[PDB]
Ligand SMILES: *[C@H]1O[C@H](CO)[C@@H](O)[C@H](O)[C@H]1F
């Protein structure tokens with residue numbers, strides 16, 4: 300494959316508001332489901348919360364300094380709905396909009412294109428009190444929030460994503476209970492998935508009407524390429540079920556193909572009520588799709604397990620990070636599939652990276668060679684994808700800096716920059732210097 304990326308390729312790093320900002324009560328911010336969840340004893344592995352995190356509400360200028368030192372040309376970050384509409388449904392908080400306005404101006408002044416995520420999991424708690432993503436009304440008010448934000452910032456921000464990883468919000472938040480709000484019911488999770496998709500579609504339409512200029516609007520999906528452990532009917536069916544559970548359940552309705560019928564049959568009475576009107580809304584045309592990629596699923600049939608009755612067959616020969624199996628070829632596979640089998644284009648890699656047991660060494664650096672190798676290998680797969688015609692326009696490393704990693708708290712470090720959570724000092728890791736020098740060469 301090729302050596303060089305396009306001259307106008309987007310090179311960035313990514314964060315999310317609750318994971319980095321802190322300042323959870325400042326300047327009118329409301330309570331989010333992640334404030335409630337992280338303050339519930341036992342939900343976070345290490346007793347931490349997002350109360351301070353990286354203090355990026357006050358220290359985003361330091362984050363900009365890091366992006367500049369890395370030679371990036373873009374920054375993917377989220378806007379906290381609790382800062383914009385603290386009650387979820389209700390009046391706006393101009394102080395919240397002004398904060399992000401200043402941030403956007405600081406990014407543009409630095410030559411960093413803002414790639415804004417509207418929803419990165421921090422649902423206002425008052426909406427969860429009224430069933431959260433279990434209620435259609437949450438979709439409606441999400442679109443109202445999207446309208447307000449674009450009205451004020453859309454003169455400067457062209458590239459917007461509605462949702463980050465609706466599979467996580469629905470299935471981890473309402474079915475498996477490991478993410479906020481922490482419910483454990485399949486029917487509620489599937490209902491949440493529909494109202495997330497509906498909220499996405501309503502927001503796209505609202506954003507286009509509210510925008511002062513044409514916008515490039517996408518959605519961001521985690522995708523897991525799935526492979527049967529054997530060619531038996533049982534294992535192949537398990538792979539199809541897992542592929543439907545994570546990938547096709549979201550890709551198909553967004554593509555105007557309805558929900559996948561095999562999954563509707565498998566889910567039975569737990570499937571949501573989806574009329575043709577909702578599906579037309581959900582398929583609101585998009586300008587790009589964001590792909591979040593870390594891992595494959597090598598599936599074996601698991602009849603006694605919870606739905607989708609498919610377990611991972613571990614490969615001890617493959618490298619593992621602090622929390623995941625490394626399989627770079629899956630990134631090529633999933634992109635080839637999107638390019639040839641689905642209508643979304645162009646594509647951005649909106650999240651890719653890894654977690655390691657990073658420490659500051661005696662010399663002062665962070666020697667994260669496995670993370671450097673992770674980036675090198677995945678970037679090579681992107682060159683293969685580009686060679687095959689995949690319309691890939693950018694890449695965002697997850698994450699700019701170590702941050703609050705959801706149910707694992709501050710204990711799971713994904714940064715290309717190290718965060719000292721006691722002093723708030725950031726330091727570039729060796730992999731970040733590698734990205735800097737690779738990008739500079741491009
Ligand atoms: C994508 O995955 C990373 C690692 O688990 C999370 O920190 C991000 O919030 C999620 F969008």
Ligand code: NA
Pocket residue numbers: 618619620621
């Ligand atoms: Na390892």
